[PDB]
Design an enzyme around this catalytic site. Structure first.
Site, PDB file in Angstrom:
ATOM      1  CG  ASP A 183     -53.493  -2.577  59.876  1.00  0.00           C
ATOM      2  OD1 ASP A 183     -52.792  -3.249  59.106  1.00  0.00           O
ATOM      3  OD2 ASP A 183     -53.599  -1.325  59.802  1.00  0.00           O
ATOM      4  CG  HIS A 207     -51.364   4.350  58.212  1.00  0.00           C
ATOM      5  ND1 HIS A 207     -50.586   4.937  57.234  1.00  0.00           N
ATOM      6  CD2 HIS A 207     -52.278   3.615  57.567  1.00  0.00           C
ATOM      7  CE1 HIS A 207     -51.066   4.585  56.052  1.00  0.00           C
ATOM      8  NE2 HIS A 207     -52.071   3.808  56.215  1.00  0.00           N
ATOM      9  NE  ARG A 251     -57.494  -3.030  52.940  1.00  0.00           N
ATOM     10  CZ  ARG A 251     -56.858  -2.042  53.567  1.00  0.00           C
ATOM     11  NH1 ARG A 251     -55.616  -1.730  53.236  1.00  0.00           N
ATOM     12  NH2 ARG A 251     -57.467  -1.383  54.534  1.00  0.00           N
ATOM     13  CB  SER A 268     -48.476   5.110  53.904  1.00  0.00           C
ATOM     14  OG  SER A 268     -49.553   4.253  53.539  1.00  0.00           O
ATOM     15  CG  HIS A 274     -60.975   2.614  57.104  1.00  0.00           C
ATOM     16  ND1 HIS A 274     -59.808   1.917  56.942  1.00  0.00           N
ATOM     17  CD2 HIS A 274     -61.030   3.451  56.066  1.00  0.00           C
ATOM     18  CE1 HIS A 274     -59.216   2.320  55.821  1.00  0.00           C
ATOM     19  NE2 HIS A 274     -59.950   3.259  55.289  1.00  0.00           N
TER      20      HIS A 274
END
Lengths: 434, 434, 434
Positions: B373, B272, B327, B242, B318
């Protein structure tokens, strides 16, 4: 036989195998270096991605699966009454690596005519867009809204093998190519014909011909122009903004609709797809600054002062092209056998003989030769297509051919997420020290 | 009197000079190689671009202008009766490189309140979208259509100096950031609340709380989750799909609306941002075919069925991270404080102990550890936001902060068109043979 | 105060000088050859005469004093609540080489109103003609009998100086142009409206509208069609049969009435102007022996039956045009705006896609593309003017403008008697043998 999907199915294993072996033996080969300057300079000179459908040679210009544009003009099927190559047949070439037969092209025209269909929500959205919404924004938004029709998105949601991505990317890409002239013509008619009825698809006419009909044009010569135009703007290797955008977004397994719409947002960029217009507005001014007629002395003079103001001549130069663009050449050939005595075209030609010698002597050019965008505007304007803000929409419809041909291949070949490593200035200084 | 545009005005000339000097001395310095494998493998570990706002260390995870997530959790200002960092302050940090004061953040909250307002055509478009057009599509489409409001597009047509580009990007970026919750919440209400119209902006509230108010939530801890969520999703260096899409499209001088809308098309890809939706689909599926609390061997079974079907485990792996995503950890921290016993959270925690040993033994994962995610969705689900198809919209709203912070800098620093070279397999086979 | 005769007075001496100088320097320059084939083939591509008002490029179509039809559509003045170009202004352009002002056109409209008046002998003759004397015959006959009013014939008998010839031609040409709708409408009313007498001239109306008023029509869009129709039919260089007949007869110093009446006898030939009637006969015939909307293979059948019977397809082919006639395209433009769905228009459009691939394969057509006559009739039919045998009269009225514009110039420039040499076949066989 004639079914393109079946021909493609047969090719993929072969190409899978070719790459597996290549990477086995040559995976670790260094093909290039990366400098600090390149990282700052937009990856200029970096060999960054594999893109199969076309390759841009600095010197000789674009080859579509090995074939130069002149070779395509000769080999690719034409319409029966026709001199120019049908974009159907180019797409076939990009997809298969092989020149189609007339029957195969015939087949594809009818495939496309049958898939040509917009759903009501997209028709409504377009009909509701205000007139100060640029045509590239209407195209982008509309193609995004079309992803409700995505086979690949649905099929992925339900779970599907990696090995089968390509089949649904194929059907979606075929659907989108089919539908694009319907979207692009609805935008034109809404903006520039007060919303008149875009009109029918003739299932026996070729894709360009249904497009020119839907735009509201009839001149067979304009249809011939559109055939050439859609053919030659189809693909320009993998590194141009629109192609790269489509590849990058596609590599996350976003569907063709989203991938293409992102690409159109790239194409809408002034440094990319809005050049044809810059050129025409610059030509127009110029013919109203040194009069309609201008001798090679007084034109040469305008160009030198132009350059002394610290300003470039638009439609000349390129990121990668180091010689005359074959896309310009072919447009010129069209111009001089079809509208040789057009005023605006005479100027474009007059610059063709004078601007290349200038720029060279200035030095800062690298490419003192013209690109496609130096020529395309005057041709469209000649046939009545005066609305300059719409010009990139034609470029978009064309570019779908190349970027979707490759998208099918990227997923067939299992290309992964595009995901390079970035650095900050701070970090890059530190890395340099260590 | 605080004005971020004035701070920027000071900072930009300093960084321009520094980068000029640095390139003067190190421009030709090699910082890495390109291999065949890299070209086939989506540029993995190729150092492709400069991106200033954040850098991802493979070993340590993301830093925002040098600051870790824990550091930002401590240093960044907070809402008064709040514990989580305000996304306003992260934006400040990304943009200026400086931790903001309470006062600066207060100003920014007020600034984004004031510029929050949607044009009626975008209102019209959203209200008319069908319930089966995916939230991310509605978001991307709506943002593309907002480009009618773009000051940069308008000024560029009029020939504005390149020295002014950053100010225009700034103004458009501030507007879009301000508008984004408005779009996102209308999509939410229209799809999932029968189009209730509750959604105003309180001028004395922070951006996150105004967002949760418009979504129809009241729980103070949902608002805190939202603040954290938007802070941590904000930026992840420039090489993610992105961020890179935004960078690529904006390098063509497309305006921030077009660059962001293309970014969202990439964020919507399964590999993504859409992974945060896919995680909860995959969880829902495993709970249906298990109890609510399954054995470790039964989880291994479900994961194995996924992997042997040619599917990925969502939220795991990743391109660059080689350990657990901070995160992820930070979201674990929130859950263990606020919802430690929630059943889906135990599952998510459960998978942390299991999935990484699988994946390693499957072999097709350089990194077996979870990404952000894997964890976002369960926190949302807890507070009643059960609409998994909406989850990437929140990610999109957050990721605006990072990509637009950089876009301002890209333009401020005169970064050129991003245009790498591509090759075909055939072309590459011949290049390695010479 | 506007007076076209005064502008002419200025322009003529300038052009006389120029042509004297040009012939002084280039008179002996060869501009082409004559072949046997040319002599047998009606002078095809032989450069036989100078004609000033319009030139036909084979590639680009007609230009009027350098201006294309699209250019004239934009530049030429219009009626106030109107879109189509006033034929008054085209005449101005043809005569002066200058685009007229709104004021100049207004003057010309007023001038032609004032000179509109028929003598009672011509009234008598028309009223007594039988219903089976073809409209074109009535027109030609009536115009021949108007020569009793000729100022040129009268002055020439009295020995008027050759320097005054152009002024007399001008006066007779203005009178005839003014009178023409009067004649044409009486023929229309007498044949097809039982001789109603509605037909006056409003002194503040343009020529076309006065014409449509006298024809008994009221629709504003018929009047606009008429304005366009009369503008585009006006002139097509000097080598077409009607223009050339006018040129030939006038080179003998026959007055404009005699020259125009002979022109009309040529315009009435099936291979010329009468084609616009023959098209609609041929359409009527094909609809009777088909449905109203036939397949493409059934159209190919009907066309093939025409061609194998030793007949031509009406409205198709041209001696000089090598693409589609712009006068065809421009009429297509009108239909798609105003009557896009009319059944006969779909047929005409239908034939455009079919007829040219036939004809090419038949071989007896250098040009397979349609001319203006392929399209005129369907527009007329739409507005209720169903009388196909009248259609060439409208063409005749329009073609007066061009041929009389030139006649003024032919006389102004002292062009002599047109008198080529002929040979017999026997005589030619002996000439090629020596």
């Amino acid at each position: 036989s004639t079914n393109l999907k079946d021909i493609l199915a047969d090719l993929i294993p072969k190409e899978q195998a070719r790459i597996k072996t290549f990477r086995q033996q040559h995976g670790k080969t260094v093909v290039g270096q990366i400098t600090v300057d390149m990282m700052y300079g937009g990856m200029r000179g970096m060999k960054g991605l594999v893109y199969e459908t076309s390759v841009l040679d600095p010197d000789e210009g674009i080859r579509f699966r090995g074939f130069s544009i002149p070779e395509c003009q000769k080999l690719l099927p034409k319409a029966k009454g026709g001199e120019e190559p049908l974009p159907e047949g180019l797409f076939w070439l990009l997809v298969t690596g092989h020149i189609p037969t007339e029957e195969q092209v015939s087949w594809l025209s009818k495939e496309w005519a049958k898939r040509a269909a917009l759903p009501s929500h997209v028709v409504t959205m377009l009909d509701n867009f205000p007139t100060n919404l640029h045509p590239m924004s209407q195209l982008s938004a509309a193609v995004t809204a079309l992803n409700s029709e995505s086979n690949f998105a649905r099929a992925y949601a339900q779970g599907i093998s990696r090995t089968k991505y390509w089949e649904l990317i194929y059907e979606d890409s075929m659907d989108l190519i089919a539908k694009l002239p319907c979207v692009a013509a609805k935008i034109y008619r809404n903006l520039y014909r007060e919303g008149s009825g875009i009109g029918a698809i003739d299932s026996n006419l070729d894709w360009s011909h249904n497009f020119t009909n839907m735009l509201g044009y009839t001149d067979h010569q304009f249809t011939e122009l559109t055939r050439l135009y859609l053919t030659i703007h189809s693909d320009h290797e993998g590194g141009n903004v629109s192609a790269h955008t489509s590849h990058l977004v596609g590599s996350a397994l976003s569907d063709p609709y989203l991938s293409f719409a992102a690409a159109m947002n790239g194409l809408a960029g002034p440094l990319h797809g809005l050049a044809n217009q810059e050129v025409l507005v610059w030509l127009t001014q110029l013919q109203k600054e040194v009069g309609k007629d201008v001798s090679d002395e007084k034109l040469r003079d305008y160009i030198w002062n132009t350059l002394n103001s610290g300003r470039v001549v638009p439609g000349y130069g390129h990121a990668v092209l180091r010689k005359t663009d074959p896309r310009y050449t072919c447009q010129r050939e069209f111009a001089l056998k079809h509208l040789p005595n057009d005023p605006m075209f005479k100027l474009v030609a007059q610059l063709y003989k004078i601007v290349p010698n200038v720029l060279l002597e200035q030095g800062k050019a690298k490419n003192p030769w013209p690109n496609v965008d130096a020529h395309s505007g005057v041709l469209l304007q000649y046939y009545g297509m005066t609305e300059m803000n719409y010009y990139t929409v034609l470029f978009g419809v064309s570019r779908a051919l190349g970027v979707l041909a490759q998208l099918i291949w990227s997923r067939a070949l299992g290309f992964p997420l595009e995901r390079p490593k970035s650095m900050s200035t701070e970090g890059l200084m530190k890395f340099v020290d260590s």
